[PDB]
Every structure is written in C-alpha cells, then in structure tokens.
Short mmCIF file of C-alpha atoms and ligand atoms in Angstrom, two decimals:
data_model
loop_
_atom_site.label_atom_id
_atom_site.label_comp_id
_atom_site.label_asym_id
_atom_site.label_seq_id
_atom_site.Cartn_x
_atom_site.Cartn_y
_atom_site.Cartn_z
CA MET A 1 -25.57 17.89 -101.60
CA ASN A 2 -21.92 16.20 -100.95
CA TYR A 3 -20.34 18.03 -98.09
CA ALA A 4 -17.42 15.44 -98.19
CA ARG A 5 -15.84 17.26 -100.77
CA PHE A 6 -15.48 20.49 -99.31
CA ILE A 7 -14.15 18.84 -96.26
CA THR A 8 -10.37 18.27 -94.97
CA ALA A 9 -9.70 14.53 -94.49
CA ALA A 10 -8.78 15.30 -90.89
CA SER A 11 -12.09 16.99 -90.70
CA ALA A 12 -14.08 13.77 -91.92
CA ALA A 13 -12.12 11.72 -89.27
CA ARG A 14 -13.29 14.05 -86.27
CA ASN A 15 -15.27 11.70 -83.74
CA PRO A 16 -17.86 12.59 -81.01
CA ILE A 17 -26.28 8.93 -60.23
CA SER A 18 -23.24 8.91 -62.64
CA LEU A 19 -19.84 8.87 -61.65
CA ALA A 20 -19.07 8.68 -65.64
CA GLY A 21 -19.43 12.56 -65.13
CA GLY A 22 -15.88 14.05 -65.83
CA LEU A 23 -17.04 17.34 -64.41
CA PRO A 24 -15.49 19.35 -61.00
CA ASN A 25 -18.11 19.62 -57.90
CA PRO A 26 -19.83 22.85 -58.19
CA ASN A 27 -20.11 23.77 -54.72
CA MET A 28 -16.45 24.09 -54.59
CA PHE A 29 -16.22 26.92 -57.15
CA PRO A 30 -15.39 30.76 -55.07
CA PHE A 31 -18.06 32.88 -57.09
CA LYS A 32 -21.24 32.53 -55.20
CA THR A 33 -24.04 35.11 -56.59
CA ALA A 34 -23.96 37.94 -59.41
CA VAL A 35 -26.17 40.77 -60.21
CA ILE A 36 -26.12 42.59 -63.42
CA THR A 37 -27.65 45.72 -64.17
CA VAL A 38 -28.69 46.67 -67.77
CA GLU A 39 -30.07 50.07 -69.00
CA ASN A 40 -33.96 50.43 -70.37
CA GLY A 41 -33.84 46.96 -69.44
CA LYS A 42 -34.61 44.74 -66.12
CA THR A 43 -32.25 43.16 -64.19
CA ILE A 44 -29.95 39.87 -64.24
CA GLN A 45 -29.72 37.96 -61.37
CA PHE A 46 -27.57 34.70 -60.98
CA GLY A 47 -28.94 32.98 -57.84
CA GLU A 48 -26.93 30.16 -56.06
CA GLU A 49 -28.31 27.67 -58.38
CA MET A 50 -28.10 30.04 -61.54
CA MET A 51 -24.13 30.66 -60.47
CA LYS A 52 -23.37 26.93 -60.17
CA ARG A 53 -24.58 26.22 -63.81
CA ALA A 54 -22.93 29.22 -65.01
CA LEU A 55 -19.53 28.32 -63.27
CA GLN A 56 -19.76 24.81 -64.69
CA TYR A 57 -19.02 23.29 -68.13
CA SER A 58 -21.71 23.68 -71.19
CA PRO A 59 -23.37 21.70 -74.00
CA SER A 60 -20.29 22.62 -76.43
CA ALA A 61 -22.63 23.88 -79.48
CA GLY A 62 -24.01 26.31 -76.89
CA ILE A 63 -26.12 26.83 -73.90
CA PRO A 64 -29.78 25.09 -75.21
CA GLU A 65 -32.02 28.38 -74.46
CA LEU A 66 -29.20 30.69 -76.39
CA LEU A 67 -29.47 28.15 -79.20
CA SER A 68 -33.26 28.55 -79.11
CA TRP A 69 -33.64 31.99 -79.25
CA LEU A 70 -31.11 32.47 -81.90
CA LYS A 71 -32.40 30.10 -83.85
CA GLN A 72 -36.38 31.84 -83.63
CA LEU A 73 -34.26 34.78 -84.78
CA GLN A 74 -32.34 33.25 -87.63
CA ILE A 75 -35.82 31.89 -89.16
CA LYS A 76 -37.56 35.35 -87.92
CA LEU A 77 -35.05 37.28 -89.92
CA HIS A 78 -33.79 34.94 -92.60
CA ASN A 79 -36.39 32.03 -92.79
CA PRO A 80 -33.40 30.03 -93.93
CA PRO A 81 -35.17 27.43 -96.79
CA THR A 82 -32.68 24.99 -95.44
CA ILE A 83 -35.38 24.69 -92.08
CA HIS A 84 -36.85 21.71 -92.50
CA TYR A 85 -34.37 19.99 -95.08
CA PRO A 86 -33.21 16.46 -93.94
CA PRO A 87 -29.43 16.74 -92.11
CA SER A 88 -28.05 15.05 -94.82
CA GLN A 89 -29.56 17.70 -97.56
CA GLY A 90 -27.95 20.45 -95.15
CA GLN A 91 -30.69 21.07 -92.64
CA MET A 92 -30.57 24.48 -91.04
CA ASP A 93 -27.91 23.90 -87.91
CA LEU A 94 -26.77 26.72 -85.48
CA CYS A 95 -23.57 26.83 -83.04
CA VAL A 96 -22.44 29.33 -80.42
CA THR A 97 -18.68 30.25 -80.97
CA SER A 98 -16.18 32.04 -78.57
CA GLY A 99 -16.59 35.14 -81.14
CA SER A 100 -17.64 35.29 -84.85
CA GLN A 101 -13.69 34.83 -85.56
CA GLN A 102 -13.98 31.38 -83.78
CA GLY A 103 -16.66 30.26 -86.18
CA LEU A 104 -14.91 31.55 -89.62
CA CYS A 105 -11.57 30.10 -88.50
CA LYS A 106 -12.84 26.71 -87.91
CA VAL A 107 -14.84 26.72 -91.24
CA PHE A 108 -11.76 27.75 -92.90
CA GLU A 109 -9.76 25.23 -91.02
CA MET A 110 -12.50 22.38 -91.98
CA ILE A 111 -12.52 23.04 -95.71
CA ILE A 112 -8.65 24.47 -96.81
CA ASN A 113 -5.86 21.66 -97.78
CA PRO A 114 -2.82 23.58 -99.06
CA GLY A 115 -3.58 24.21 -102.90
CA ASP A 116 -7.28 24.39 -102.73
CA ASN A 117 -8.79 27.62 -104.45
CA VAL A 118 -10.94 30.62 -102.63
CA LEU A 119 -12.96 33.46 -104.19
CA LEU A 120 -12.64 36.75 -101.91
CA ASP A 121 -12.95 40.10 -103.03
CA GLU A 122 -9.66 42.17 -101.80
CA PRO A 123 -9.98 44.65 -99.76
CA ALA A 124 -10.85 41.95 -97.29
CA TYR A 125 -10.41 41.51 -93.30
CA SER A 126 -7.35 41.19 -91.75
CA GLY A 127 -8.41 38.25 -89.81
CA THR A 128 -9.63 36.62 -92.12
CA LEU A 129 -6.36 36.90 -94.83
CA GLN A 130 -4.36 36.11 -91.58
CA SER A 131 -6.55 33.11 -90.97
CA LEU A 132 -6.32 31.73 -94.70
CA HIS A 133 -2.70 32.67 -95.25
CA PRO A 134 -1.15 29.46 -93.14
CA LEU A 135 -3.69 27.32 -94.86
CA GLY A 136 -2.21 27.06 -97.94
CA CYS A 137 -4.76 27.99 -100.14
CA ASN A 138 -5.04 30.25 -103.42
CA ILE A 139 -6.61 33.46 -102.98
CA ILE A 140 -8.35 34.40 -106.49
CA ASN A 141 -9.03 38.19 -106.46
CA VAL A 142 -12.77 39.06 -107.35
CA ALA A 143 -13.01 42.36 -108.76
CA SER A 144 -15.12 44.60 -106.60
CA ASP A 145 -16.71 48.11 -106.19
CA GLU A 146 -19.38 50.50 -104.22
CA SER A 147 -22.01 48.12 -104.71
CA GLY A 148 -19.83 44.82 -103.66
CA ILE A 149 -18.07 42.15 -105.64
CA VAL A 150 -19.10 42.36 -109.39
CA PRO A 151 -21.10 39.14 -110.23
CA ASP A 152 -19.59 39.69 -113.74
CA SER A 153 -15.68 39.36 -112.29
CA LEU A 154 -16.69 36.32 -110.22
CA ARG A 155 -18.99 35.28 -113.71
CA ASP A 156 -15.43 35.55 -115.80
CA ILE A 157 -12.94 33.66 -113.01
CA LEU A 158 -15.40 31.11 -113.15
CA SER A 159 -15.08 30.54 -116.90
CA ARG A 160 -11.76 28.96 -116.03
CA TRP A 161 -13.90 25.48 -115.17
CA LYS A 162 -16.57 23.62 -116.27
CA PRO A 163 -19.77 23.18 -114.08
CA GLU A 164 -19.30 19.32 -114.04
CA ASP A 165 -15.72 20.03 -112.88
CA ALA A 166 -16.93 20.72 -109.32
CA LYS A 167 -18.02 17.06 -109.11
CA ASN A 168 -14.78 16.04 -110.52
CA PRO A 169 -11.60 15.38 -108.15
CA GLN A 170 -8.40 16.06 -110.34
CA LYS A 171 -10.18 19.68 -111.05
CA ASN A 172 -9.57 22.21 -108.43
CA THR A 173 -12.51 24.01 -108.60
CA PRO A 174 -13.10 27.03 -105.76
CA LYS A 175 -13.80 25.51 -102.40
CA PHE A 176 -15.90 28.86 -101.29
CA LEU A 177 -16.61 32.39 -102.18
CA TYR A 178 -15.80 34.69 -99.01
CA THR A 179 -17.69 38.03 -98.23
CA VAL A 180 -18.71 40.77 -95.99
CA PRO A 181 -22.27 41.62 -97.57
CA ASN A 182 -22.57 44.50 -95.18
CA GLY A 183 -20.18 46.94 -93.99
CA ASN A 184 -16.91 45.71 -95.57
CA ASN A 185 -14.09 45.94 -93.08
CA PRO A 186 -12.47 47.82 -94.49
CA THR A 187 -14.20 49.77 -97.44
CA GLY A 188 -17.76 49.82 -95.80
CA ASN A 189 -19.45 48.86 -99.08
CA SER A 190 -22.78 46.55 -98.79
CA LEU A 191 -23.60 44.11 -101.39
CA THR A 192 -27.37 44.71 -103.33
CA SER A 193 -30.17 42.34 -103.57
CA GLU A 194 -29.79 41.52 -107.20
CA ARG A 195 -25.93 41.08 -107.38
CA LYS A 196 -26.31 38.55 -104.49
CA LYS A 197 -28.92 36.67 -106.60
CA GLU A 198 -26.47 36.56 -109.47
CA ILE A 199 -23.67 35.55 -107.13
CA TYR A 200 -25.62 33.15 -105.14
CA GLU A 201 -26.82 31.70 -108.87
CA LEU A 202 -23.07 31.53 -109.43
CA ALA A 203 -22.13 29.55 -106.47
CA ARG A 204 -24.90 27.11 -107.73
CA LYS A 205 -23.60 26.79 -111.41
CA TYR A 206 -20.12 26.27 -110.25
CA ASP A 207 -21.59 24.65 -106.96
CA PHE A 208 -19.45 26.24 -104.48
CA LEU A 209 -19.78 27.09 -100.75
CA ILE A 210 -20.43 30.89 -99.58
CA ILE A 211 -19.23 31.78 -96.38
CA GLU A 212 -21.52 34.78 -95.49
CA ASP A 213 -19.39 36.26 -92.60
CA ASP A 214 -21.99 39.30 -91.60
CA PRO A 215 -21.18 41.06 -88.33
CA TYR A 216 -22.13 44.50 -89.26
CA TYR A 217 -25.42 43.38 -90.49
CA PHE A 218 -27.74 44.94 -87.48
CA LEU A 219 -25.42 48.07 -88.25
CA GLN A 220 -27.08 48.55 -91.55
CA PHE A 221 -27.92 52.74 -92.20
CA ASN A 222 -29.94 51.40 -95.64
CA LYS A 223 -33.15 51.29 -93.50
CA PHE A 224 -34.98 48.47 -94.94
CA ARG A 225 -32.03 45.67 -94.59
CA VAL A 226 -30.99 43.73 -97.57
CA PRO A 227 -31.88 40.13 -97.73
CA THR A 228 -28.98 37.40 -96.52
CA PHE A 229 -27.28 34.47 -98.91
CA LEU A 230 -28.66 32.26 -95.97
CA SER A 231 -32.03 33.64 -96.28
CA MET A 232 -31.70 32.84 -100.15
CA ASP A 233 -30.17 29.47 -99.61
CA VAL A 234 -32.22 26.88 -101.26
CA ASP A 235 -29.37 24.56 -102.00
CA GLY A 236 -27.82 24.48 -98.47
CA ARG A 237 -24.35 26.00 -99.41
CA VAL A 238 -24.31 28.82 -96.96
CA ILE A 239 -22.05 28.91 -93.97
CA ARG A 240 -23.37 32.07 -92.30
CA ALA A 241 -21.21 34.07 -89.22
CA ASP A 242 -23.30 36.33 -87.12
CA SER A 243 -21.59 38.34 -84.43
CA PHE A 244 -22.70 39.87 -80.90
CA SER A 245 -19.52 41.83 -80.73
CA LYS A 246 -20.54 45.18 -82.58
CA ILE A 247 -24.18 45.22 -80.79
CA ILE A 248 -23.99 43.32 -77.70
CA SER A 249 -20.35 42.79 -76.35
CA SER A 250 -16.90 42.38 -78.19
CA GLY A 251 -15.16 41.10 -75.03
CA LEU A 252 -17.70 38.40 -74.11
CA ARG A 253 -16.67 36.55 -77.26
CA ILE A 254 -20.14 35.33 -77.97
CA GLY A 255 -20.67 34.87 -81.90
CA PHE A 256 -22.92 32.26 -83.67
CA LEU A 257 -22.52 30.22 -86.79
CA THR A 258 -25.86 29.28 -89.20
CA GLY A 259 -25.59 26.50 -91.81
CA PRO A 260 -25.75 22.89 -93.18
CA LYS A 261 -26.20 20.65 -90.21
CA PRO A 262 -23.14 18.41 -91.53
CA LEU A 263 -20.66 21.11 -91.99
CA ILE A 264 -21.80 22.82 -88.46
CA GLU A 265 -21.61 19.25 -86.75
CA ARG A 266 -18.08 19.24 -88.44
CA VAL A 267 -17.00 22.40 -86.47
CA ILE A 268 -18.96 21.70 -83.42
CA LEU A 269 -16.08 18.71 -83.02
CA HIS A 270 -13.20 20.87 -83.52
CA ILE A 271 -14.63 23.00 -80.76
CA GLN A 272 -14.94 19.83 -78.60
CA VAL A 273 -11.17 19.60 -78.82
CA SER A 274 -10.44 23.07 -78.65
CA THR A 275 -12.31 25.44 -76.24
CA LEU A 276 -14.76 22.60 -75.31
CA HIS A 277 -17.79 25.40 -75.44
CA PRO A 278 -18.30 29.29 -74.95
CA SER A 279 -18.15 31.03 -71.45
CA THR A 280 -21.48 29.34 -69.75
CA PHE A 281 -21.56 32.67 -67.85
CA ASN A 282 -21.36 34.91 -70.96
CA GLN A 283 -23.77 32.86 -72.77
CA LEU A 284 -26.05 32.66 -70.23
CA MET A 285 -25.46 36.56 -69.36
CA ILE A 286 -26.71 37.49 -73.44
CA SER A 287 -29.36 34.60 -73.20
CA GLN A 288 -31.35 35.89 -69.98
CA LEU A 289 -30.91 39.50 -71.08
CA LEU A 290 -32.19 39.11 -74.76
CA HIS A 291 -34.99 36.94 -73.30
CA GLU A 292 -36.69 39.17 -70.89
CA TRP A 293 -35.94 41.67 -73.98
CA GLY A 294 -38.01 39.94 -76.64
CA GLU A 295 -37.46 40.39 -80.27
CA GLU A 296 -38.92 43.94 -79.98
CA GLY A 297 -36.43 44.51 -77.27
CA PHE A 298 -33.89 43.25 -79.23
CA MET A 299 -34.74 45.57 -82.40
CA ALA A 300 -35.33 48.48 -80.08
CA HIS A 301 -31.53 48.01 -78.79
CA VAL A 302 -30.38 47.47 -82.64
CA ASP A 303 -32.40 50.91 -83.55
CA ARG A 304 -30.95 52.95 -80.90
CA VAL A 305 -27.35 51.43 -81.91
CA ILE A 306 -27.74 52.21 -85.58
CA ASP A 307 -28.60 55.53 -85.17
CA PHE A 308 -25.45 56.53 -83.05
CA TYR A 309 -22.94 55.11 -85.85
CA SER A 310 -25.43 57.06 -88.19
CA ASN A 311 -24.48 60.11 -86.64
CA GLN A 312 -20.78 58.91 -86.15
CA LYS A 313 -20.93 58.46 -89.99
CA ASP A 314 -22.51 61.75 -90.78
CA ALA A 315 -19.83 63.18 -88.18
CA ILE A 316 -16.72 61.55 -89.71
CA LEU A 317 -18.05 62.49 -93.20
CA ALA A 318 -18.88 65.92 -92.03
CA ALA A 319 -14.97 66.06 -91.09
CA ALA A 320 -13.69 64.43 -94.30
CA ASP A 321 -15.59 66.91 -96.25
CA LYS A 322 -13.98 69.98 -94.34
CA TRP A 323 -10.35 68.66 -94.48
CA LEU A 324 -9.91 66.07 -97.38
CA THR A 325 -11.23 69.11 -99.72
CA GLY A 326 -9.88 67.36 -102.50
CA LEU A 327 -6.48 65.52 -101.13
CA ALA A 328 -8.31 62.21 -101.33
CA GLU A 329 -11.33 60.02 -102.33
CA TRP A 330 -14.21 58.52 -100.21
CA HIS A 331 -17.46 56.43 -100.70
CA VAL A 332 -20.59 56.89 -98.11
CA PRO A 333 -20.13 53.97 -95.53
CA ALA A 334 -23.19 51.57 -96.31
CA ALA A 335 -23.11 50.02 -93.29
CA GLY A 336 -20.65 49.14 -90.21
CA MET A 337 -18.20 51.20 -88.42
CA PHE A 338 -15.40 52.12 -91.20
CA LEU A 339 -14.37 54.93 -93.41
CA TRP A 340 -12.28 53.85 -96.31
CA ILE A 341 -10.05 56.78 -97.63
CA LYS A 342 -8.03 57.02 -101.21
CA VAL A 343 -4.99 59.64 -100.50
CA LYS A 344 -4.78 61.52 -103.76
CA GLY A 345 -1.04 61.68 -105.30
CA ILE A 346 0.62 59.12 -103.04
CA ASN A 347 1.57 55.39 -104.07
CA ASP A 348 1.97 54.62 -100.18
CA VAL A 349 0.50 55.87 -97.14
CA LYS A 350 1.92 53.42 -94.54
CA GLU A 351 4.82 55.51 -93.91
CA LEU A 352 2.73 58.79 -93.38
CA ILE A 353 0.88 57.05 -90.60
CA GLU A 354 3.19 55.02 -88.26
CA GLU A 355 5.73 57.51 -88.78
CA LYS A 356 4.44 60.71 -89.64
CA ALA A 357 0.55 60.63 -88.25
CA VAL A 358 1.01 58.80 -84.83
CA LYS A 359 3.88 61.43 -83.85
CA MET A 360 0.97 64.03 -84.04
CA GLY A 361 -1.36 62.03 -81.74
CA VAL A 362 -3.52 60.69 -84.86
CA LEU A 363 -3.49 56.80 -85.75
CA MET A 364 -5.65 55.33 -88.15
CA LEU A 365 -4.49 51.89 -89.93
CA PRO A 366 -2.81 51.59 -93.23
CA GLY A 367 -4.88 49.89 -96.23
CA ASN A 368 -1.82 47.17 -97.02
CA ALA A 369 -3.22 45.24 -94.04
CA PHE A 370 -6.56 44.26 -96.16
CA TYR A 371 -4.51 42.59 -99.03
CA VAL A 372 -3.20 39.15 -99.66
CA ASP A 373 0.31 40.91 -100.76
CA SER A 374 0.97 43.16 -97.75
CA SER A 375 4.30 44.34 -99.41
CA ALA A 376 2.44 45.88 -102.39
CA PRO A 377 1.99 49.67 -101.64
CA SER A 378 -1.65 51.01 -100.41
CA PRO A 379 -2.65 54.90 -100.96
CA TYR A 380 -5.29 53.36 -98.47
CA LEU A 381 -6.44 54.49 -94.98
CA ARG A 382 -9.46 52.78 -92.60
CA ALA A 383 -10.77 55.40 -90.19
CA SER A 384 -13.18 54.38 -87.35
CA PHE A 385 -16.08 55.97 -86.63
CA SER A 386 -17.00 53.86 -83.74
CA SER A 387 -15.44 56.07 -80.94
CA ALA A 388 -14.11 59.35 -81.67
CA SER A 389 -15.81 62.32 -80.94
CA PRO A 390 -16.80 64.85 -83.85
CA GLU A 391 -14.09 67.40 -82.10
CA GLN A 392 -11.79 64.41 -82.24
CA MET A 393 -12.45 63.63 -85.80
CA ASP A 394 -11.72 67.14 -86.93
CA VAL A 395 -8.55 67.33 -85.00
CA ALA A 396 -7.81 64.09 -86.90
CA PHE A 397 -8.74 65.37 -90.23
CA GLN A 398 -6.88 68.52 -90.26
CA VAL A 399 -3.71 66.73 -88.78
CA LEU A 400 -3.99 63.81 -91.68
CA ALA A 401 -4.53 66.51 -94.36
CA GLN A 402 -1.46 68.28 -92.97
CA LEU A 403 0.48 65.04 -94.07
CA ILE A 404 -1.05 64.51 -97.05
CA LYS A 405 0.26 68.40 -98.32
CA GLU A 406 3.79 67.41 -96.99
CA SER A 407 4.37 64.54 -99.21
CA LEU A 408 2.77 66.20 -101.98
CA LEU A 409 5.78 68.74 -101.91
CA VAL A 410 8.45 65.75 -102.69
C1 LIG B 501 -15.63 41.00 -90.57
C2 LIG B 501 -14.90 40.49 -89.33
N1 LIG B 501 -15.24 39.55 -88.98
C3 LIG B 501 -15.04 39.02 -87.65
C4 LIG B 501 -14.42 39.88 -86.89
C5 LIG B 501 -14.36 39.56 -85.45
O1 LIG B 501 -15.21 38.98 -84.93
P1 LIG B 501 -15.74 39.08 -83.22
O2 LIG B 501 -15.07 38.27 -83.05
O3 LIG B 501 -17.42 39.30 -83.68
O4 LIG B 501 -15.49 40.77 -82.96
C6 LIG B 501 -14.27 40.97 -87.37
C7 LIG B 501 -13.70 42.13 -86.13
N2 LIG B 501 -13.03 43.28 -86.69
C8 LIG B 501 -11.99 43.84 -85.75
C9 LIG B 501 -12.05 43.19 -84.83
C10 LIG B 501 -10.84 44.03 -83.77
C11 LIG B 501 -10.58 43.44 -82.42
C12 LIG B 501 -9.82 43.89 -82.02
C13 LIG B 501 -8.54 44.68 -82.56
C14 LIG B 501 -9.18 45.64 -83.51
C15 LIG B 501 -10.17 45.00 -84.42
N3 LIG B 501 -10.36 45.09 -85.95
O5 LIG B 501 -9.40 45.88 -86.31
C16 LIG B 501 -11.53 44.87 -86.54
O6 LIG B 501 -11.48 44.93 -87.66
C17 LIG B 501 -14.47 41.49 -88.17
O7 LIG B 501 -14.52 42.65 -88.63
CL1 LIG B 502 -7.92 23.00 -112.03
#
C-alpha cells in the first residue's frame, strides 16, 4: 500500500536527570487531590502523585494504559487483519483524540487538496460537511436508503474511472468514501454485513480509503452487532473513528482513531502542533474507571445504555404513530439517537421550525443542515430521542402535527 498518494504535501512535510524537559514544575499546580464516584462501579482516587501526573503534559497519541485498553478492545471487538502487518503495510495503530471530531477533521485535513473527489452519502453529518466544505473537495453524492449506501450507486459512480487510474496522478480518483455505518446522523439508518462487503470490495477495485465514522456503534438496537469495515480491512484502507461521547462523556472530549500506522502517525504529528495531547486528567479519568470495570464491566454499561435509548426509540415512535398519523414518513431508527421525519405535502420545512415550531416551545433541526447544498429545500426533520420524556415527545408531536396542517391549508 502507498499512503503518500492519499496524503497532502504539507502532511508528508510534517515532522516529529534532564534539563531538556520543557515541562512546568508539577508541585506548582493548585489542584492537589481528587475523588470521583461512579454508579454500579467503584471509586476513583487521584492521590498527590496521580494528580501531579493528571495535571502535567501527556504522550500526545494518548496515555499508555488508555491506548493499551482501547487496543485490546479494538482486537476483542474487530480483530482487524492489519494487527500484525508491517508498519508500512498499514499495521493497526490507535490514537486518542479530543473527541472523535478531532480524529475525523485531522484525517480530512491530511488528505484533501482543493479539487480532490470525496465519496459520501447525503444526508450526512453537519459537522463533517462543515469540515470538508472549506477544504476544496468535490463531494460526489452516493445514493442511500433504509439499509444505507447502495453498493450499486457507488458501483455506477466508480464506472467513471478505470481501476488502474488510482495509480495515475492526472486521474482524480476518489481519495476516500465517508460513512456512518450505524445509526447515521440524521437518518438513523445502519448498513448490512452484505452491503459493507460489496462496498469494501468496491474500495479494493478502485483502491480508495474508507473513513468509518462510527460514534453510535455501541448504541445498536440490532441485538448482534454488525461486523465493521475495520473488522474486514485486509488491505489497510480503513481509518475508523470511535467516540466515548455517546456512552461515557461528550463533555470530557476523549475520542479514538484506529487505522494504518503511517496514516495515524500523520494525524498524531498534526495534533503535536495543535492541542499537543487530550486532557491527561480526563484520559486517566476514563482509563482508571474502564480498567477496574473490565470488558464485562464495559459491556454491562453498554447494554444498560442501549436499552435506555431502545425505550426512547420505542417512545418517540409510539408518539409519531399517534400524531404524525399520515402527515409524514419515517423509518424505524436502526441505531443511535435520531428520528428522521419526511413531512408530507411540503417542499421546505425550515420555515415552520425556526419561525412556527420554536414560538410553540418545540424545537427540532431542519434537514437543510445535512446536505452539501444547504440552500435547496428540505421537507425533513431530525428529532432526538436522546433526552425528551415520552410526555415531552407527545406534547412536541401534537404541536408539530398542528403546524404540518396549517401549511397544508396554503
Ligand atoms: C457522526 C458524528 N461524528 C462526530 C461527532 C462528534 O463526535 P464527538 O466529538 O465524539 O462527540 C458527532 C456528534 N454529533 C453531534 C454532536 C453535537 C454536539 C453539540 C451540539 C449538537 C450536536 N449535534 O447536533 C450532533 O449531531 C457525530 O454525530
Ligand atoms: Cl479524472
């Protein structure tokens, strides 16, 4: 594998008793000791020495024990083929980020030169669209559905090029394909094992990278979790983004990238000149807890959380059924925390949200946000079952429905 091709010139030009130590004196920091309790788990303690560790600078790719525990999990969950490959051949490498957004952004940054082609299915994450836009890439939209990206659409799109063209600079082959394989923001649609095989196979034929942005992986209502692109990455073409935001803490800013050693190493260098490293305090906070828990301790917690949002999914749907009677259309969310609604008989919905819905104390995101062309009208809504109560959901839909009707009288 040649990683140099997928890389931007600036990325490749990146570069890595002691008085050398450009670190401040630890004994000069005000916060002396910490005690953090955990429900259905033990108690975390940050003693004098542990606190001095937590308050001082850290490795950059992450704290050693957080990186080891995560490495163990990535193998124990995806057993990536790349595990024992030579580094140059795309050997599996991990990297702790200050949220999964840091991982993705840095990856996009290290890949995209203005003019480069990117494969992505619309509607896609606002944050990533927002990331790629200033970057200068051409987003080629790949046709999706309830089961995700249609391998056939990707198959048709790729037919523009020849499988040899990937080797040829002068031929602008797609640098990567971007997907949310489980519970896509904003649709909530998840891919299938079959389709993923077809897509990976397509990635091989046309030789492009796959950035697997999977934050709602642990939040699968599916029962037996579907195998990942990383879990099937023979070549070493997968950059996989995991998040602790949806299960452990969004505020702590601790995410984790898993991909080929050369590519991960390219992001690590960028973070060296950007944030230096993620909060050593929070990395230790996560580490210590999920260490004393174990993989069983972790999997119990994940199950506990999936069955909360399962009822939240059940709840919002039990509401949509009641109030969106036949005023809109929706797919049962596969995973994650979003319900994606198609308001029947209306071209644009943005108006009757930030002007009609808000004044009614109900607010949910218009679909416009999830498209490259934000100007073009959307009859879509993205409703979050992450927080609102069944009562709240009921009171929310009863409003929304009212508004759907008024605009139907125009
Ligand atoms: C697919 C995908 N990739 C990356 C991220 C960010 O990952 P993180 O850093 O691990 O939390 C996200 C989080 N998505 C959202 C976050 C959010 C935060 C504040 C306010 C609104 C937010 N809305 O709207 C979101 O959808 C995501 O959906
Ligand atoms: Cl071309």
